[PDB]
Amino acid sequence: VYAQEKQDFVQHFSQIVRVLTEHPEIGDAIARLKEVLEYNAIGGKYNRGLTVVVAFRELVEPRKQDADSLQRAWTVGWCVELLQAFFLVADDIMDSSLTRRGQICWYQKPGVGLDAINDANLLEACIYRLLKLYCREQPYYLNLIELFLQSSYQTEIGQTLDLLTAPQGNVDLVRFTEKRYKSIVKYKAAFYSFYLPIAAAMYMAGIDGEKEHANAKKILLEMGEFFQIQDDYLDLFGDPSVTGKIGTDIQDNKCSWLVVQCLQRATPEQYQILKENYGQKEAEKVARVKALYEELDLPAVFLQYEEDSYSHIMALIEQYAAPLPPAVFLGLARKIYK
Amino acid sequence: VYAQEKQDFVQHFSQIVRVLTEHPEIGDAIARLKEVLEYNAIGGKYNRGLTVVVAFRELVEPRKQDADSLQRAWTVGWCVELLQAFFLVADDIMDSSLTRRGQICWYQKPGVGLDAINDANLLEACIYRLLKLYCREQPYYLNLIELFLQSSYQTEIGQTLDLLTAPQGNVDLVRFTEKRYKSIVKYKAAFYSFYLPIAAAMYMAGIDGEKEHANAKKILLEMGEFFQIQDDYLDLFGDPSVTGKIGTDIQDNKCSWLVVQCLQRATPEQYQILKENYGQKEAEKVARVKALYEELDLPAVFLQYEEDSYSHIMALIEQYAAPLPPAVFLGLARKIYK
Ligand SMILES: O=P(O)(O)C(O)(Cn1ccnc1)P(=O)(O)O
Ligand SMILES: O=P(O)(O)C(O)(Cn1ccnc1)P(=O)(O)O
Ligand SMILES: [Mg+2]
Ligand SMILES: [Mg+2]
Ligand SMILES: [Mg+2]
Ligand SMILES: [Mg+2]
Ligand SMILES: [Mg+2]
Ligand SMILES: [Mg+2]
C-alpha cells in the first residue's frame, strides 16, 4: 500500500521540472536541461527522495505540516534524487557502464557522449536552485546547503578511493582488503544514500543538535554499508531486468565486496585463477571469475551476511533511535532488507 | 611592479593545499586531491584570484584589513581559481583539448583519463570546504556560498549553449549568428571571470546592495564578453607558447567570434569554402578556414573591435563605477586590454 506515497512524490516532478525550466536566449539550454532531468531523475525507485517526505511527516507536528511546508519537503526529496542523478551520470561514464534504470546510460546515447559531464554538473546546480527558490527564508536554509555540499564532498572522496583502488589493466589484488573496502563504501555510498535524506528531514523539523545527528549517523552509515555490499553482490548475481543495469565490477577491476570475500577464502591456485582473469574485458575471463565465486559459496556467504547485518542494524536502532520515532529507521530497514 | 602582488598570492597556495589535505583511511584520496590541486590550479596568471585580493584592499578600510581578514581575502581568491580549475578540467575533456597552461591537459595524462571528471568535481568541492573553514562565522558567508553557486550555474548554462551550438560532425553555420554568440559568452565566461571575483570582494567589504552589484555587473559583463572574444581570436591567431594551449574551435565546430565575423563578410563562394571545411579534424581543412579568415581581414577586424571595446568599457566605468573606487575596474581593464 506504500505505492501511494510514491505516486504523490512522482506527481510533483512535473512541478520541479516546470519551476527549473522557467530569458529566450537560454531557451535551447533550458530545453536540454529538461531532457537531462526527464531522462535521469525518472525510472528509479525514488526511495532516497521519498525518505525525506516520509521522515518529515514522522518528525514534524501535523499542525506545522501545512501545504507550503509539505511542498518544501517534496522539493528537498527531489534535491536528494538530483544529487544521486548527478553522481550516477558521471559514475556511468567513469565505470564505462552500458545501462541504468532499464535504458542505455545517458552518456551512451547517440549525440550525448562526453557532453554528459556538463549535464551531470547541471543536475547538481538544480539542487541549490530549488533550495533557494523554496527554502531561502527558512531557518534551516544554510543547514541544508551545507548538508548537500558535505554529502557531495564525502561521495567524491569515496569515488576517488573507488577509482584509485581500481586502476584499468593493473593487477591490484593485494590492495583488495576488508579495511580498504570499508573505507571506500563509507564515503562513496553510505553518507548520501541514508544519512543525507534523514538529516535533511531532521534539519527541516528543527532537529539540528550535533548528538542527534551523530546518533542518526551511527544507524544510517551501517545501513549504507549494507546497501553498497548488496549493490556489489547484485552487480554479478542480480537479475538485470530487476536491477535495471548491467554489471561491470569484474571488467573494471573494482574492489568489490565479492572480490574481497573471494580473497579471504581462495586457495593459492584459486588466487592465481582470480589474478589471471580479474580486471579484463574478455567475457570468458569474467565467466571464470563468476565460476570461482560460485565455487567459493559467495552467494550463501552474502545471504548469511544480509541476515547478520539486518540483526546488527536493528540492534543499532534500539541503541540510537531515541528520541526520534523508531518508525523513521524501521521503514528504511524494511525497504532495504526486503 | 605588479609581480609582487602575484608572488604573495602564489605563496599562499601552499597553505591552501596543506589545509585541504589535513583520517588515515582517506590518505590515498587526499594524496590524489593534492596532485589534482598542484597540477591544475598552478601554471596560470592568477588574475581572477588576484582580483579578489586587490579589490578587497581597495574596498575595505585599512584599519579593518587585519591578518585574518587578509587571509580570508587570499582564500576566497584561491576559491575563484578553484572554480576556474573545475570548469577547465571538464571543458578540456568536452572540447577534446590537448594542452593547457603549457602542459598536457590533466585528462590526457596517462593513467588519468575520464577519472578527471571526479577530479574536476573535487576541485569544485574544495571551494565550499575553504569557505566553511575560513568564512563560516562571517556575516557575508551565505552571500559568498550563493555567489559561487550562481556563478557555477550560469557558467554551466553557457557551457550547455556552447556544446548545443557546436554538434560534432553537423554543419551548423546558419546557427552561428551574432545574437547566438552574445548569449553563449554572457553565460559561459563573463559571470565567473569578472563579476565573481569583484562581487566576492564587495560582499567581504559589506557592499551587499542590489543596485551596487547591478552597476558593477554592467561594467564587468562587458569586460567578460571582450575577454571571451579575445579568447576566440587567440584560439587560432594566438601564439601557443604564450597562451599555453592549442586551439580546437574550428575542429570542434564552435560558434567562435571568428566564424560569426566570417559569415558577416563572406561571399556565397567563401561561405561554401567555410561550409565544406569547418568542424572537421583534417589539418588541411582547418588551414583552409584560417586562410579564409586572413583573406577577410579578421585579425584587423579584431584589432579594431579591441579598440572600440576598450573605449566602450572605459565609458561604462565613468557611468557605473560610483560609489566604488574607479581603480577597482581600471586595474582590471589594464590587465585584460594590454
Ligand atoms: O558500483 P558503483 O559504486 O559504481 C554504483 O553503486 C554507483 N555509485 C557511485 C557512487 N556511489 C554509488 P552503481 O552500481 O549504480 O554503478
Ligand atoms: O573556448 P572555451 O569556451 O572552451 C575556454 O575559454 C574555456 N571556457 C570554458 C567555459 N568558459 C571558458 P578555453 O579556450 O580555455 O578552452
Ligand atoms: Mg558504477
Ligand atoms: Mg562507480
Ligand atoms: Mg555497483
Ligand atoms: Mg575549451
Ligand atoms: Mg569550451
Ligand atoms: Mg577558447
CATH number, domain of B256, equals 1.10.600.10
Nearest CA-CA distance, residue B122 and chain A, Å: 6
- Verify whether residue A176 is a known catalytic residue: no
What's the CA dihedral at B106, B108, B114, B117 to 10 degrees? 20
C-alpha cell, A268: 593459492
Beta bridge partners of A167: none
Radius of gyration for chain B, computed over Cα atoms and rounded to the nearest angstrom: 21
- DSSP 8-class letter at A192: I
Q: Are B147 and B200 in contact (CB under 8 A)?
A: yes
* A20-27 own/partner pairs: CB under 8 Å, 24+ apart: A20/A126, A20/A129, A20/A130, A25/B179, A25/B182, A25/B183, A25/B186, A26/B157, A26/B161, A26/B183, A26/B187
Question: What distances in angstroms separate CA A268 from CA A170, A265, A271, A274, B268, one per listed residue?
Answer: 20, 10, 5, 10, 74
Q: Which residue has the cell 586572413?
A: B294
Look at residues A151, A117, A122 and name the one whose alpha carbon lies nearest to residue A17.
Answer: A122
The H or E element spanning position A103 is strand A103-104
Q: Are B313 and B321 in contact (CB under 8 A)?
A: no
C-alpha cell, B317: 566605468
Beta bridge partners of A99: A104
Choosing from B91, B104, B248 the residue with most ligand 2 atoms within 8 A of its CB, the one to mutate for a pocket test is: B91
Instruction: Write down the experimental method used for this entry.
Output: X-ray
Q: Residue A244: which residues within 8 A CB-CB, separation 6 or more?
A: A43, A99, A100, A101, A102, A103
Note the residue count of chain A.
338
Beta bridge partners of B99: B104
Q: Are A106 and A36 in contact (CB under 8 A)?
A: yes
Q: Are B119 and B89 in contact (CB under 8 A)?
A: yes
- Do the Cβ atoms of B117 and A93 come within 8 Å? yes
Q: Are A236 and A249 in contact (CB under 8 A)?
A: yes
B95 lines ligand 2 (CB under 6 A): yes
Catalytic residue numbers of B, as ranges? 45, 86, 91, 95, 100, 162, 188, 227, 231-232
* A115, A159, A165 ranked by CB distance to B163: nearest: A115
Which is the closest atom of ligand 2 to the Cα of B95? 4
Backbone angles phi, psi at A87, to 5 degrees: -65, -35
Residue A64, SS3? helix
Question: C-alpha A24: how far from its chain's center?
Answer: 36
Separation between Cα atoms, residue B276 and residue B279, nearest integer Å:
9
Best residue of B89, B153, B186 to probe chain A, by most A CBs closer than 10 Å: B153
Nearest CA-CA distance, residue B66 and chain A, Å: 27
Question: What distances in angstroms separate CA B148 from CA A116, B76, B92, B122, B124, one per listed residue?
Answer: 22, 10, 21, 15, 10
B252 lines ligand 2 (CB under 6 A): no
Indicate the number of domains in chain B: 1
Separation between Cα atoms, residue B126 and residue B122, nearest integer Å:
6
C-alpha cell, A286: 569474467
Can you say whether residue A42 is alpha, beta or left, with left for phi > 0 and alpha for psi between -120 and 50 degrees? beta
Look at residues B169, B149, B167 and name the one whose alpha carbon lies nearest to residue B157.
Answer: B149
Separation between Cα atoms, residue A253 and residue A96, nearest integer Å:
12
Instruction: Find the domain containing A310 and state its range.
Output: 1-338
**Residue A163 with chain B: CB contacts under 8 Å:** 115, 118
- DSSP 8-class letter at A107: G
Q: Are B257 and B229 in contact (CB under 8 A)?
A: yes
Q: Are B218 and B315 in contact (CB under 8 A)?
A: no
Helix boundaries (H) for A21-66: 27-40, 47-59
- DSSP 8-class letter at B42: S
C-alpha cell, A134: 523554496
**Residue B26 with chain A: CB contacts under 8 Å:** 157, 161, 183, 187
Q: For residue A20, give the amino acid letter.
A: L
Q: What is the resolution of this structure in A?
A: 2.0
Catalytic residue among A9, A13, A92, A95: A95
